[PDB]
Amino acid sequence: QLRLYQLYSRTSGKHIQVLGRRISARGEDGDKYAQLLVETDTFGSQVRIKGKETEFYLCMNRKGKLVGKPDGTSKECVFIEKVLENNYTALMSAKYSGWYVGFTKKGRPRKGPKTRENQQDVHFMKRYP
């Protein structure tokens, strides 16, 4: 299943942007770089996230850095989607368990190794523009 939406960062107050190679969470509602095509496998656990504008996939490299890439074949470009008890959604790397997609209050992306599930930095709400 394919779906289109935006991811609102609990800490940054803005939406995730796939600007190209660079990833950020400073998108106003409706920002063209914040429109995300999200692919969900038949199990419902794993997702690929693609910026609709740039066509770059959101991925996490070995250094734990979030980065956009044109090629989304890598397992670094897959995330496990968890709806938490607090009703936010988190995105854990499928390649690097225990590492999460996250951002600072200024929308700067965080390093996987330095994250964990209970951090607000890694919490998101889904949004249908």
Author numbering: 51 to 179
From the article:
FGF18 was incubated stoichiometrically with heparin (6 dp) and the complex isolated prior to crystallization in a mother liquor of 0.1 mol/L MES pH 6.5, 0.2 mol/L ammonium sulphate and 26% PEG 5000. The final model consists of residues 50–179 and has a β-trefoil core formed from ten anti-parallel β-strands arranged in three groups of three or four strands connected by tight turns and loops. There is a disulfide bridge between Cys109 and Cys127 that joins the β6 strand with the β7–β8 loop, helping to stabilize it. The four FGF18 molecules in the asymmetric unit have root mean-square deviation (RMSD) of 0.30 Å2 (Cα atoms). Differences are mainly at the crystal contact sites with greatest variation in the β4–β5 loop, residues 90–96, which in the FGF8 subfamily contains an extra serine residue that presumably increases its flexibility. In our structure, sulfate ions are bound to the canonical binding site, but not to the proposed secondary site. Three of the five sulfate ions are clustered in a location distinct from the heparin-binding sites of FGF1/2, but occupy a continuous stretch of basic residues that is, in part, formed by the lysines identified as interacting with heparin by Xu et al. (2012), and could represent an extension of the canonical site.
Fibroblast growth factors (FGFs) regulate a plethora of critical processes in development. FGF18 has a number of functions in the developing and adult organism including a key role in skeletal development and has undergone clinical trials for the treatment of osteoarthritis (Merck KGaA).
